[PDB]
Amino acid sequence: QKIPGNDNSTATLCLGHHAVPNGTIVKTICNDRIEVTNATELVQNSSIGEICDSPHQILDGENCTLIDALLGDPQCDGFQNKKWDLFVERSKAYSNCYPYDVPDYASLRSLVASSGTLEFKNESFNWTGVTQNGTSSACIRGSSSSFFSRLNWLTHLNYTYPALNVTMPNKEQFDKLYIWGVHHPGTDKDQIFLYAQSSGRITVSTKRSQQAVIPNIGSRPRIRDIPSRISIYWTIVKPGDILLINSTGNLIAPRGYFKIRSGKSSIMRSDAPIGKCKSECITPNGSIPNDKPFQNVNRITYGACPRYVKHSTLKLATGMRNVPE
Amino acid sequence: QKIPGNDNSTATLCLGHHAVPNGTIVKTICNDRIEVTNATELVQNSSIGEICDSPHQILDGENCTLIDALLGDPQCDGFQNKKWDLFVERSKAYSNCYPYDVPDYASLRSLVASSGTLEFKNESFNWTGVTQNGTSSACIRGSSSSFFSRLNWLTHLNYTYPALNVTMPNKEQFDKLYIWGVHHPGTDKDQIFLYAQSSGRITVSTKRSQQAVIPNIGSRPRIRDIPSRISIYWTIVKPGDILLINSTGNLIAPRGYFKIRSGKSSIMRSDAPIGKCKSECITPNGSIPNDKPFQNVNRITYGACPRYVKHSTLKLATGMRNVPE
Amino acid sequence: QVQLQQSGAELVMPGASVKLSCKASGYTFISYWMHWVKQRPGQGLEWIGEIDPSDSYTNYNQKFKGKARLTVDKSSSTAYMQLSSLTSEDSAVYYCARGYYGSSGYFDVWGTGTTVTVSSA
Amino acid sequence: QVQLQQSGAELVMPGASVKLSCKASGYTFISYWMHWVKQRPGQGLEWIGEIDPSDSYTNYNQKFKGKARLTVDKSSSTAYMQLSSLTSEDSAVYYCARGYYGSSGYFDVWGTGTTVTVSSA
Amino acid sequence: QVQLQQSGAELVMPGASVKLSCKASGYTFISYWMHWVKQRPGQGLEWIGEIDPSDSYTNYNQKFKGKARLTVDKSSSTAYMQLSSLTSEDSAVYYCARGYYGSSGYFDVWGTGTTVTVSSA
Amino acid sequence: GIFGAIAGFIENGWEGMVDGWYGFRHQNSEGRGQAADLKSTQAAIDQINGKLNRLIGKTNEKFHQIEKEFSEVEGRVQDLEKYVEDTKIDLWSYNAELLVALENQHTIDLTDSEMNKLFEKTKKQLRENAEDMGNGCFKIYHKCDNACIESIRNETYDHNVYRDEALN
Amino acid sequence: GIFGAIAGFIENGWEGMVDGWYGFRHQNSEGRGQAADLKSTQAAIDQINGKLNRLIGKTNEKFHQIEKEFSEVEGRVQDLEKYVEDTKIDLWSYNAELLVALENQHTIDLTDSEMNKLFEKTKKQLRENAEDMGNGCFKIYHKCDNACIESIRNETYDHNVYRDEALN
Amino acid sequence: GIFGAIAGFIENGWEGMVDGWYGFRHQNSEGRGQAADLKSTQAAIDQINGKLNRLIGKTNEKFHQIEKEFSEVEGRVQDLEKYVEDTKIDLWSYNAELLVALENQHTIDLTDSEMNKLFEKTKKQLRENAEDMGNGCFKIYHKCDNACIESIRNETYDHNVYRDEALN
Numbered sequence A, B: 001q002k003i004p005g006n007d008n009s010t011a012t013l014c015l016g017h018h019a020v021p022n023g024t025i026v027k028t029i030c031n032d033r034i035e036v037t038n039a040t041e042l043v044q045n046s047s048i049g050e051i052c053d054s055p056h057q058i059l060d061g062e063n064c065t066l067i068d069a070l071l072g073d074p075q076c077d078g079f080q081n082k083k084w085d086l087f088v089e090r091s092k093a094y095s096n097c098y099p100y101d102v103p104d105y106a107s108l109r110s111l112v113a114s115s116g117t118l119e120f121k122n123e124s125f126n127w128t129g130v131t132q133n134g135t136s137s138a139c140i141r142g143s144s145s146s147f148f149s150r151l152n153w154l155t156h157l158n159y160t161y162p163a164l165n166v167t168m169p170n171k172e173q174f175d176k177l178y179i180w181g182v183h184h185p186g187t188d189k190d191q192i193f194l195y196a197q198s199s200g201r202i203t204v205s206t207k208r209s210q211q212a213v214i215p216n217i218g219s220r221p222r223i224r225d226i227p228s229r230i231s232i233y234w235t236i237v238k239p240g241d242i243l244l245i246n247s248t249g250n251l252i253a254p255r256g257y258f259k260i261r262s263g264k265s266s267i268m269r270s271d272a273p274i275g276k277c278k279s280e281c282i283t284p285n286g287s288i289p290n291d292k293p294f295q296n297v298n299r300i301t302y303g304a305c306p307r308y309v310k311h312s313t314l315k316l317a318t319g320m321r322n323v324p325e
Numbered sequence C, D, E: 001q002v003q004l005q006q007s008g009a010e011l012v013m014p015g016a017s018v019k020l021s022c023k024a025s026g027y028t029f030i031s032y033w034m035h036w037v038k039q040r041p042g043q044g045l046e047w048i049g050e051i052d053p054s055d056s057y058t059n060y061n062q063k064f065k066g067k068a069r070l071t072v073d074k075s076s077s078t079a080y081m082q083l084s085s086l087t088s089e090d091s092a093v094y095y096c097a098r099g100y101y102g103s104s105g106y107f108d109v110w111g112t113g114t115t116v117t118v119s120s121a
Numbered sequence F, G, H: 001g002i003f004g005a006i007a008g009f010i011e012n013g014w015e016g017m018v019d020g021w022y023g024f025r026h027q028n029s030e031g032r033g034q035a036a037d038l039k040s041t042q043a044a045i046d047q048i049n050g051k052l053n054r055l056i057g058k059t060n061e062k063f064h065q066i067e068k069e070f071s072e073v074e075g076r077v078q079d080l081e082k083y084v085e086d087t088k089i090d091l092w093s094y095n096a097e098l099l100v101a102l103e104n105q106h107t108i109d110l111t112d113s114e115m116n117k118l119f120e121k122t123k124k125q126l127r128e129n130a131e132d133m134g135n136g137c138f139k140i141y142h143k144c145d146n147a148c149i150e151s152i153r154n155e156t157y158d159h160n161v162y163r164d165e166a167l168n
Ligand SMILES: *[C@@H]1O[C@H](CO)[C@@H](O)[C@H](O)[C@H]1NC(C)=O
Pocket: A062, A063, A094
């Protein structure tokens, strides 16, 4: 802003503008390397690396998977009947019981992530002539080798498996989710010895819809000494409807309904531990601050989170054009 | 620009900007029929009509589909063990020998398209007591009627089909895609006389998952004198995981495994022949040069292609506003 | 194609008058100027005048005042040359040339020429 | 971190000349002004002069003509005073200070001072 | 709904003073001009004067100097006339009218009128 | 934000400017020539090239996608695939039409005015001799030759005041 | 829609401004100086904050979404999820890049000129005292002290136009 | 890219926008008045109608789509359908809010300034008797009647300068 010199009669008042000696390079619609005085980094480049559960109700998942948290996971029975707003599943993911294989595992994971409120109301039933509370061999709880706490391992009683015809009406105001299963033995001799005679048949039907399954028999690869699989099913019941567990063979019946609420809940496969902060946006890397419009941390989010973009350094021109000399 | 008189009392001058008498109509946010000096046609209106394959290794068509090549089409034996970055499927392509009916055909098509790397490692197996290397009638291969080259046809041997229990673990460090099938005959008498006794029972289980199928016996309409179908299944195996083919009846077994890696390949359905350019964008109408942001050639693309829009004449005002007259 | 089509040859009396033509085509007439170049056989090229097709600005060579005049017809895209008081020294080939605007004056497109001959025979 | 580095103490003849220095760092030299403030022992601070580092515009205090002279070196980001005809009344601690532009002149960053003693001992 | 409400009928002595009212409503007062039109019984309409409600700019008819005086009250959105030196020739019906700004002056909304009678009876 | 020059007080324009986008047409005693301000047209061409760097070339290498061309109907998942492909195409077609509209509008808006530099350059030697000209042709009363227009082009113009005409 | 001042005739500006975003210098007889504006800097900061209201905060509470990472390969249902998430990410990344481009351009465009208020304010008293200056370096021929510059910055300036000894 | 007139030096404006958007106001010996520039208001209404031509009517005629209103939970695909519908609306709502913001900003920008046409028209007739003025009102020294202001409105003015007085 060159000013001529000491002038008396005139006054050269170079009414100019403001400059900053340091500059920040931002992108415009014309030039990709323009420089501005100040710039706000819109994309959250990095996290604090930690999950902080103070604003939300983040439930830890150390040696826990959510579908086994629904089940009787012996390493995860300390999280039973626990509310959560965000379940984090640890990358170690060590499940130590019979190998469950939900045929629509992603669907059940997304369903209970959407519900997010674990209230297992232990419901009485009409199982007559069965052997409830079976003994597993890979669930490790109290050195007793019990089954899942929440699923009942119904087998023969007095060498007889009657055709079960149990029901429990929905006489309440909320939905009742029934998490049941069907067992896939290694051999036909195993099914004959354990559950019933010859094959098995299950027809689980609500009033409005039905779900039937035939168990499969075959020699699976052994996981922790089990040549078998258990496949888990879900039977959402609307108010006023009737749930009717009609099974003849490999029934793994629920001990009670799971209360579901269409609430602010989700799941997130992560590895960072639980800490203490004030931030409501959580990422598998860790809880990031919410004061950014975009991010580059990860795709998977929960809560009031910035939107994921593929860029890394979108800086908003939070000032005028820099001409720092 | 109307300039003043010559004399001008010899004390004058002038100024202007621009003109060119050509005219090009572009669209703005205010008007839709404004005229500019120059304009770049942002939408690739037309192609060259031919698939030219210099940047991407594009594998040929010639009456054989990708699933035909994966099944080992007797019409196309010259495509085995052939790497490819882009597959083009001819519109004149037809199936041969047995009509395969993959129950999730688009899923397998997309899976092997994303694979894009054919190396059928001819893995040795333990098929004992079966009549492998079976011969069909609708196959044509040197006028000899030889079955699929990339997988095996197994029937009874010495009027006996033992319950096969083979396994081959993943001792390597890459995923091994296994392509197997189950045979759906045209008659119960055909099932009894040809494969095994009575019905069949097939379960193919990995450590991490399981796939099972019961064969179905029907009376399907004849294609090339074949009143039957086969259905093809895939059993992706992670490193360390162990595959276990378990079957009692109809086993259309692999002769090995297909190598799969997370490549950047894709399938494409087209009819254009093979030529030469330097163009890395391919469309079913033929390769277009991707020196444009958008296109109106086709929806399906491969590689670095402009984004398909429903417009046809998006012209950017590369120049400025024209006042020609 | 930008071509300045030009007329044929003429033969008139000494002291008579002739009117030449040069039809412009393929481009907008009022954009670029017109210039005419005289070349006597065995001699050098000479610049005689310039015109503005938009509003008829006249600038002539100093040696050719009152002898060469420039007119245009904007309807037909034609540039005309009227010559007066012809002498035997005037026999030359007159080239109709295009011209960039003003004193820059680089003649981007030329013409073919008319054999103008002055004789009493 | 902005700091106005300052030289050591000097002890010169009465009537001789001394040239102080103040090397500015951490900020662009031409932006903020440079001011020098004199403080006698036990007395009040006194404002010497004011200089523009961009083009060497100088205004001096009315008691300080011919005694203080302000110069800058824009390459090394430093400012100098030159003292002429020194007397024992000039013995003080000279602080080089930054400043806002011009007459507003609030000295946001100060210096450590320079003990200048004028004596024949 | 815009309507220019007026007062009732009023009777004065000859030479007395009366002040009329016209309360504008339904529109912002300072926008449109206020005009007064007098209709004598059985005669033609006559234009009295014009006033700017924003800043009290007044232009009067040439026959109405010293006789009509136009004032406004911007708080209550109303306009007044002051009458001086009244005579029996002044008995008529006075209509207050709105108007477009300035000389164009088309009276888009009219008023009901007030009967003013000047008599000694 | 139009500036009202290219459609405003520059009403016709001359068609011969093949070397540059802008120019400084003039009229002298020695011939009414032309010009081309390389700085302004270079700035305009540079911002067009910067616009086309995000557009012409350097696309997104999207290799494998979903199947968009379809056949006889299969299920609800085919309807979902068609719906997501159609919504992507509608979003991208709206987005491309919007992008063309904003960038054509911005190209018209920026290639407009910036002739105030010539105004302020000419002011201090035009302020005294018959005062101020701005109607589109700078009727410059500085009696000069092609050297002064060369200086105006070069942005190296001094202020030799013409006090012979102060008011008329 | 650039106005060509901050990259135009305000060539570098001066960095000893910590009192705002826009400036006012002077070269009075009582020493030079500078002072920042009150309402124009506040207007620029207010529109920046208005931009940041829809950017900083007001993030949509998307609680439960689809799984965006996969370990195994499933096919039709999986690559559709990958396709919809990748198209959402590409659309939102283009939206973010486009948004940054448009409002960085708009921030550069609006933080430009607005000298015209000072030009018109100085104009009527700078008509007869040796005319005017058009740059950002006003030669205000009104011989006035720091109180005059206080009136210039204070938007309350009476016009004592200087009668004689002007225009030579 | 604001121009600083409507919120700038048009501090109040008058409320007779019944015949046009833009106005022409005056002071006279023969009474004041008001008009409307038919060219400017017709231009502005033309850009408004062109903005509305892509918006009012001509909607994208999409007949069959995926089911958006849902029921009791199914698990897969329904979650994907809700996700793709949510993101579709989330992108379209951001796109609608962005479109409203850009077009309202651009409408405020284009319905701004354009005093420069009248300024350059009046500069020639005020360059020698008094000078111009831009603070609020537009002072014109040319003593004339409603016909001269009509010629100002008609954009056909002859620049007849009273040369009797220079600046006083
Ligand atoms: C359970 O988790 C803890 C850390 O949370 C870990 O140290 C331990 O090894 C885990 N249990 C097993 C059986 O791996």
